[PDB]
Amino acid sequence: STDSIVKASNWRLVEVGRVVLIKKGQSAGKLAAIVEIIDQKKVLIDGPKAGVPRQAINLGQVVLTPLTFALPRGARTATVSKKWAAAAVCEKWAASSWAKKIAQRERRAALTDFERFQVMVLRKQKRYTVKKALAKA
Amino acid sequence: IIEPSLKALASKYNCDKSVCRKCYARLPPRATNCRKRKCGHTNQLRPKKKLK
Amino acid sequence: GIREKKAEYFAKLREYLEEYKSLFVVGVDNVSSQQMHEVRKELRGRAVVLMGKNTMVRRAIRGFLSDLPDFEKLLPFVKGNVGFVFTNEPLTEIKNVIVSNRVAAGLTVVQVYDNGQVFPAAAAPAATSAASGDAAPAEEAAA
Amino acid sequence: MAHFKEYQVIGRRLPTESVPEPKLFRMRIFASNEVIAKSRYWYFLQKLHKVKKASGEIVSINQINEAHPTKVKNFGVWVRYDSRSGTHNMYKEIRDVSRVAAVETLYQDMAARHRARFRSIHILKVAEIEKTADVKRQYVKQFLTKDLKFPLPHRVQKSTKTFSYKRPSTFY
Amino acid sequence: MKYIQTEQQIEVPEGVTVSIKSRIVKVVGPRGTLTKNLKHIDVTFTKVNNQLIKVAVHNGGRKHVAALRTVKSLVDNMITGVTKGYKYKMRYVYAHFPINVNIVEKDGAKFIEVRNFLGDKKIRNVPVRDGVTIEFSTNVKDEIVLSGNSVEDVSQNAADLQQICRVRNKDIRKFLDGIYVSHKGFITEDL
RNA sequence: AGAACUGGCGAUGCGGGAUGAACCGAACGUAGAGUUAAGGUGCCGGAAUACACGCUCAUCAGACACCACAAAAGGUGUUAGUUCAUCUAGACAGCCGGACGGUGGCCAUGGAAGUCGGAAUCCGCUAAGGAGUGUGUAACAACUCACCGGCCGAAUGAACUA
RNA sequence: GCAGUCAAGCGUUCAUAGCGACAUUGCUUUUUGAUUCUUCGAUGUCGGCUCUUCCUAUCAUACCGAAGCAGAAUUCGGUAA
Ligand SMILES: [Zn+2]
Numbered sequence: 001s002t003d004s005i006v007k008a009s010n011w012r013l014v015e016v017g018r019v020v021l022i023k024k025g026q027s028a029g030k031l032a033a034i035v036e037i038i039d040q041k042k043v044l045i046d047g048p049k050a051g052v053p054r055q056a057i058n059l060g061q062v063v064l065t066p067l068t069f070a071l072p073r074g075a076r077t078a079t080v081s082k083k084w085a086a087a088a089v090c091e092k093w094a095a096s097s098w099a100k101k102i103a104q105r106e107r108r109a110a111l112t113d114f115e116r117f118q119v120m121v122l123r124k125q126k127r128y129t130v131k132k133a134l135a136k137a
Numbered sequence: 138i139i140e141p142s143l144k145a146l147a148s149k150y151n152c153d154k155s156v157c158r159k160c161y162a163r164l165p166p167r168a169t170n171c172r173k174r175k176c177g178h179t180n181q182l183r184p185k186k187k188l189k
Numbered sequence: 190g191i192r193e194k195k196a197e198y199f200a201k202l203r204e205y206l207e208e209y210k211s212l213f214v215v216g217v218d219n220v221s222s223q224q225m226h227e228v229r230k231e232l233r234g235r236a237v238v239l240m241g242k243n244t245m246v247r248r249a250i251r252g253f254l255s256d257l258p259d260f261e262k263l264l265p266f267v268k269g270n271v272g273f274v275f276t277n278e279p280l281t282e283i284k285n286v287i288v289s290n291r292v293a294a295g296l297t298v299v300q301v302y303d304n305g306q307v308f309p310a311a312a313a314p315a316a317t318s319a320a321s322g323d324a325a326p327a328e329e330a331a332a
Numbered sequence: 333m334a335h336f337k338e339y340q341v342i343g344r345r346l347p348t349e350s351v352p353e354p355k356l357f358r359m360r361i362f363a364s365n366e367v368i369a370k371s372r373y374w375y376f377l378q379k380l381h382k383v384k385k386a387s388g389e390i391v392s393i394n395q396i397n398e399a400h401p402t403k404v405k406n407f408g409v410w411v412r413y414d415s416r417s418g419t420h421n422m423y424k425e426i427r428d429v430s431r432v433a434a435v436e437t438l439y440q441d442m443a444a445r446h447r448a449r450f451r452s453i454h455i456l457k458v459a460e461i462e463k464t465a466d467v468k469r470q471y472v473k474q475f476l477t478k479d480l481k482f483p484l485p486h487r488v489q490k491s492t493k494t495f496s497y498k499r500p501s502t503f504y
Numbered sequence: 505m506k507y508i509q510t511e512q513q514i515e516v517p518e519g520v521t522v523s524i525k526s527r528i529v530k531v532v533g534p535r536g537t538l539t540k541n542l543k544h545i546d547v548t549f550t551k552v553n554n555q556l557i558k559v560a561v562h563n564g565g566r567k568h569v570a571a572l573r574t575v576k577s578l579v580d581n582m583i584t585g586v587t588k589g590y591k592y593k594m595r596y597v598y599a600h601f602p603i604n605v606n607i608v609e610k611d612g613a614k615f616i617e618v619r620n621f622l623g624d625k626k627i628r629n630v631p632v633r634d635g636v637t638i639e640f641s642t643n644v645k646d647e648i649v650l651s652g653n654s655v656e657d658v659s660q661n662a663a664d665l666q667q668i669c670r671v672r673n674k675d676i677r678k679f680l681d682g683i684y685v686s687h688k689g690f691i692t693e694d695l
Numbered sequence: 696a697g698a699a700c701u702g703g704c705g706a707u708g709c710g711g712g713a714u715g716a717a718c719c720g721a722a723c724g725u726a727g728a729g730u731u732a733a734g735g736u737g738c739c740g741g742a743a744u745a746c747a748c749g750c751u752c753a754u755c756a757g758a759c760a761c762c763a764c765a766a767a768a769g770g771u772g773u774u775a776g777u778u779c780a781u782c783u784a785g786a787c788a789g790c791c792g793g794a795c796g797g798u799g800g801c802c803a804u805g806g807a808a809g810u811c812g813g814a815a816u817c818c819g820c821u822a823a824g825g826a827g828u829g830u831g832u833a834a835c836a837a838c839u840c841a842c843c844g845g846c847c848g849a850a851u852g853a854a855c856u857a
Numbered sequence: 858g859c860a861g862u863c864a865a866g867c868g869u870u871c872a873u874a875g876c877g878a879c880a881u882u883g884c885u886u887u888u889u890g891a892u893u894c895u896u897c898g899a900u901g902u903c904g905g906c907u908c909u910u911c912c913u914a915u916c917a918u919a920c921c922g923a924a925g926c927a928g929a930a931u932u933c934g935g936u937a938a
Contacts, residue, residue: 004516005523006551011483011504024746036404037475039427040482040508040563041748044404054402056429058747059484064504074404138599139680147597147680150666158873159769161923161934170771174754175935178770186874186924188677195784198822218845222795226820240822242844244785252784270792270845272822415857422776437748444749445775446857471505482508483562485548505774566773675926696892767882768862 012064014043017071019089024061027052031065031093033084036074048081049090067092154185198241199249205239206257209275212302214263215287216271220296227291236276236283243267259305266300266307280313333439333450334364336432340394341373346387356391357381362435362455366393398430406467406476407434410456413448421456425469431458510569511560512576520583522557524549529579533586535653540582545571584690585653591695592662593687596646597680598622603669605648605683607638621669622681628668633661648683651691659688 012018018034022045032047038056045062046054054077069087071080084090093099111119139147155164159176163185170180206212213236217225228238246267250260276283284298301308339361345354359376363369370393374385404427411422424441426434435458442448467473487504516522520533527542527549546568551557559579561572584590596603604619608629616630616638632638636658641647648665652658662685669682689695 001523002521003523004521004551004554004557005525006549006557007525008550009483009485009503009548011485013481013483015481037480038404038429039475040506044402044429056402056404056433060747064484139597143595143597144680146595146684146686147682150682150684151676151680156923159934163922173935176770178772180770181873183873186677186926188675189927191781192784199784217793219792222793222821222824222843225793225822226795229820240844242785242822244783245822246784248784268845417857420777420856424776440748441775447750474508480508485546485562672921674928675924678927765883766861 012066013068014059014064015068016073017068018064019067019069019093020045020062020064022047022052022057022061023063028061031089032062033069033071033080033089035071035080046075046077046080048077049084054080065093065098066096152185152187155182156185157181158183195245198245199252202239202241202246202249203253205237205273205275206253206260209237209277210304211276211278211280212263213274213276213283213287213298214266214271214300214302215274215296216269216299217296218270221293224291224293224295228287228296231286231290232274232283235278236274236286239273239275241273243269243271246273260302262307263302271299272296281315284310284313333368336362336364336435336439337369338362338396338398338432338435339366339369340392340396341369342391342393343373343377343388344391345383346389360396362432369393396431398432401430404429406461406464406472407431408457408459408461409434409438410458411438411442412454412456413442413446414452415446415448423468425461425467425472427472427475431460434458506563506565507561507569509560509562510564510572511558512572514557514559514576514579514583516555516557517583517587518555520587521554522579522583524557529582531579531582531586533583535586535589538582538586538653540578542575542578545575547572547575581655585655588690588692589651589653590655590658591649591651591689591691592658592685593641594648594650594662594665594683595686596648597682597684599679599681601681603646603681603683607632616665618665618668618683622671622679630661630665630668633657636661647686662688 030050030052032045032052036044157171158181162173298310342358361369377383407426428434486502522531529540531538601623606617608617614632618628636652639649
């Protein structure tokens with residue numbers, strides 16, 4: 001090296017346009033966006049698309065996601081909805097592992113007894129062709 | 138012996154101090170409070186006494 | 190007291206902006222307390238020089254943007270360490286008493302004001318050559 | 333003293349044949365329920381005017397719902413409170429989305445910082461500071477800056493189960 | 505009151521390199537390299553360019569914010585030591601018994617030896633620290649001079665010498681003897 | 696030690712206060728099922744290592760009524776607050792420029808020009824510059840400072856309350 | 858019995874180096890009072906001798922800070938049983 005190498009933590013910022021995942025409550029599970037910062041432990045959020053009511057909420061019951069998108073600070077519900085659509089948030093969200101795994105673990109949870117059986121017979125069938133591969137190179 | 142300027146050097150260290158009048162702690166000459174936990178960080182200081 | 194004195198500065202400032210119709214905005218960056226004391230004597234004829242704090246002058250000038258309002262486009266020039274020289278004498282005479290005289294190793298003119306106008310003091314430094322040839326290259330343009 | 337509601341409380345002296353139509357007096361009252369709101373009303377009327385509920389009545393009780401409940405506003409709050417050794421006036425500011433919310437953290441804050449319980453506190457005035465830079469306390473101007481953003485370092489997810497087969501990370 | 509954000513700036517001058525990982529700092533310059541472990545403070549470094557690095561403390565209160573500034577100076581002092589470098593000058597002070605001062609060593613230790621302090625038949629030894637070099641002024645009587653890249657290590661070695669000569673059981677206003685710091689600065693850009 | 700009204704203990708188990716005549720809760724046939732009181736819910740120990748906003752770091756922290764004590768007096772620890780004053784006519788702080796003329800002011804003397812020292816503190820020109828804050832000279836010089844301005848851009852000083 | 862706060866005063870000069878009046882806050886339970894709760898079908902009643910152990914409000918001994926510490930001597934204080 002001959003540069004000054006300084007690796008700074010790349011934190012999710014609480015900021016207007018930060019999209020967040022609601023951990024707790026009656027809108028738990030859903031995404032919303034940060035509209036306005038109230039104080040160091042509180043924010044105003046809005047999730048028109050995902051069906052979550054514009055409210056003040058503790059940053060405790062929400063997890064910041066890596067998603068941000070252009071949003072004027074204070075935007076009423078209506079325009080939030082327009083900017084969220086414009087930015088294709090849900091699109092980007094669904095493309096993440098974070099989204100996929102939640103969906104996977106919900107699919108697993110939905111399985112019938114019978115379906116688990118099949119998963120067993122299929123997973124078993126797969127193992128066979130794998131250990132063969134495993135014993136070649 | 139000892140030139141006036143070296144006699145000043147030794148005085149910056151030995152002679153130019155204040156003293157806590159509660160616990161005798163030897164403090165910087167312009168200190169407002171004492172640094173010691175034991176006398177309750179008092180602001181009752183006094184200058185270290187000069188020689189003849 | 191502190192308000193009293195500042196208000197006085199607003200007074201004598203206005204006093205020059207009405208009487209004197211022409212203004213020299215100079216810049217005395219560095220410059221001794223002695224030099225300025227001598228520019229006074231060397232201008233005791235007509236011009237008077239008036240120094241002040243920039244924050245005062247803009248506020249004062251803006252405060253007088255009612256009557257005598259064309260001192261608005263004077264404000265972009267009252268930055269840095271500038272001063273004022275008001276006068277009722279011919280242009281190019283005073284300017285060269287200021288600049289060249291009492292120079293050291295003086296003070297520089299940064300802009301000039303004349304009846305609502307803003308001279309760079311460069312256009313003032315005319316040689317009557319660019320004004321004669323323009324009256325010469327146009328007569329031949331008509332012949 | 334709970335989850336607060338604001339009340340319009342209005343009463344009057346009982347009519348006398350000498351004074352039918354005595355004047356109506358109103359208060360804005362933060363309390364948990366109407367039964368406290370009414371009682372706080374008389375508490376003050378006793379002290380301000382010279383009246384006892386035994387001779388006056390309660391004309392109307394109405395809840396003042398916050399006008400713009402999802403719009404963040406800066407609140408100026410004025411308070412009179414008693415201490416272990418004196419009684420004092422105070423100005424404070426609170427940033428929130430409703431008066432009712434503002435009052436709640438005021439009542440909490442008085443208790444944490446000054447050990448002042450509900451009984452020991454009069455609320456004098458609560459007023460949404462209209463023009464920013466009429467805000468006068470640093471801990472709120474701090475949040476008034478433009479394009480304002482901050483991280484939340486050292487994040488501690490709560491574990492659902494007692495044992496964990498991986499060392500946790502605080503990485504947010 | 506807890507401060508939403510507060511920061512400091514470190515000018516990285518022409519010729520030095522500063523690299524930071526896990527709050528461990530390495531500063532490399534024409535005089536050499538210095539390392540420092542700042543794990544004991546929660547600060548997050550961020551680089552703007554090879555000339556400037558910003559230190560910050562998000563959401564911190566008074567005593568936390570106070571450490572921020574001292575991190576700057578800490579790192580600052582490293583940078584200058586590795587370019588300008590540091591030098592502490594001292595002076596021998598005695599009224600009768602001339603303090604005789606030499607360098608001796610065992611197993612390649614290097615000590616500062618001090619004899620005849622106030623007539624003392626005893627012999628004091630200050631271990632010389634790794635990275636500080638002891639010279640003796642040639643144009644100034646009874647001086648002695650300690651130079652290195654680290655103020656920390658140089659100033660401390662200077663104090664160790666000065667502290668070994670502390671005069672016991674006498675009025676120390678009258679018995680002014682000792683070795684005291686006479687000047688402190690650099691080894692570059694004048695003296 | 697001695698009275699007043701009431702409630703207790705004595706004569707009374709039970710739940711709580713670790714413990715305990717008198718406190719809190721509640722008074723008692725033999726049992727089942729539910730719900731509670733006072734008090735509790737990290738583990739001992741039945742019951743949220745619950746939710747929420749702050750405060751606190753104690754090389755003698757603190758932790759619950761009766762109750763198993765603490766004071767006059769102090770702190771530039773940290774938190775919130777009050778008051779007077781300064782400041783968008785630009786302060787505070789930081790960096791930078793200027794810091795002048797009568798005049799080496801009068802005495803005093805080897806020599807003393809702002810700065811060993813006596814008495815005076817005046818004027819000019821000022822945006823400002825003391826008949827002088829220091830450093831330095833034999834005495835001048837040179838440098839510094841009060842004072843003013845350049846840049847910056849919203850807070851700053853002092854005394855207090857708990 | 859022991860320790861504080863205030864500072865008039867002492868200390869050639871100087872309140873606080875060392876002290877400290879008038880007043881005033883406390884601590885202790887080796888004094889002595891006060892009380893009468895336990896023991897009057899009995900807890901051997903003083904001092905010394907002997908031996909162990911504890912308290913620290915420290916006399917000595919270790920290392921310090923302070924002085925009206927020049928040295929020698931002393932005094933004030935800290936960590937210290
Ligand atoms: Zn002390």
